[PDB]
């Protein structure tokens with residue numbers, strides 16, 4: 001199971017957001033990790049490229065993976081989801097409904 | 113081919129599955145029992161329009177190309193037909209790729225349902241290995 005927090009959050013423009021995910025109830029090591037965003041009013045979910053303003057922290061011992069998003073604006077409002085990758089780092093939102101990966105329950109972000 | 117249990121355990125062992133990614137050989141044989149009933153030709157359509165192929169019921173949306181599944185990614189870089197051979201090599205090598213990332217042997221739901229948390233050594237007992 002992947003526990004994703006917070007479920008919902010409101011931020012001011014210019015703040016940063018950190019989302020935390022932890023893989024629990026698993027006897028296997030944490031593999032590759034994936035992050036997805038669906039912008040408010042958009043309907044297409046998309047993978048996030050890690051790097052630059054998007055900073056991932058992985059801890060193998062605790063099986064924790066977190067994402068920091070720097071310098072928020074209204075354009076960042078929407079829903080964010082973390083999950084497990086497959087095949088050595090392949091990410092696709094449809095993995096979240098598959099038998100091959102698990103995903104967090106999502107973070108609904110509002111930016112003032 | 114419909115394999116015998118010990119026949120399959122032997123083939124899986126020579127193919128290097130014992131303790132692969134920490135999963136003892138019994139896991140793999142038990143997985144095949146509940147996924148394909150030991151039938152290399154098992155071919156099961158899913159409601160999303162993908163298909164599961166072969167002894168380990170590997171799905172055409174992600175892992176192989178069957179020519180009929182939109183959103184297909186062919187992550188094992190094989191035709192789905194290779195997964196239906198009486199030779200389990202392509203299935204094993206795909207399963208080894210699968211299991212080395214993601215959710216381990218949870219990739220096989222029948223493993224979760226019938227194998228995880230059992231005495232999997234039962235599946236190789238009585239076999240000359």
Ligand SMILES: [Cl-]
Nearest residue numbers: 016017018019
């Ligand atoms: Cl935060």
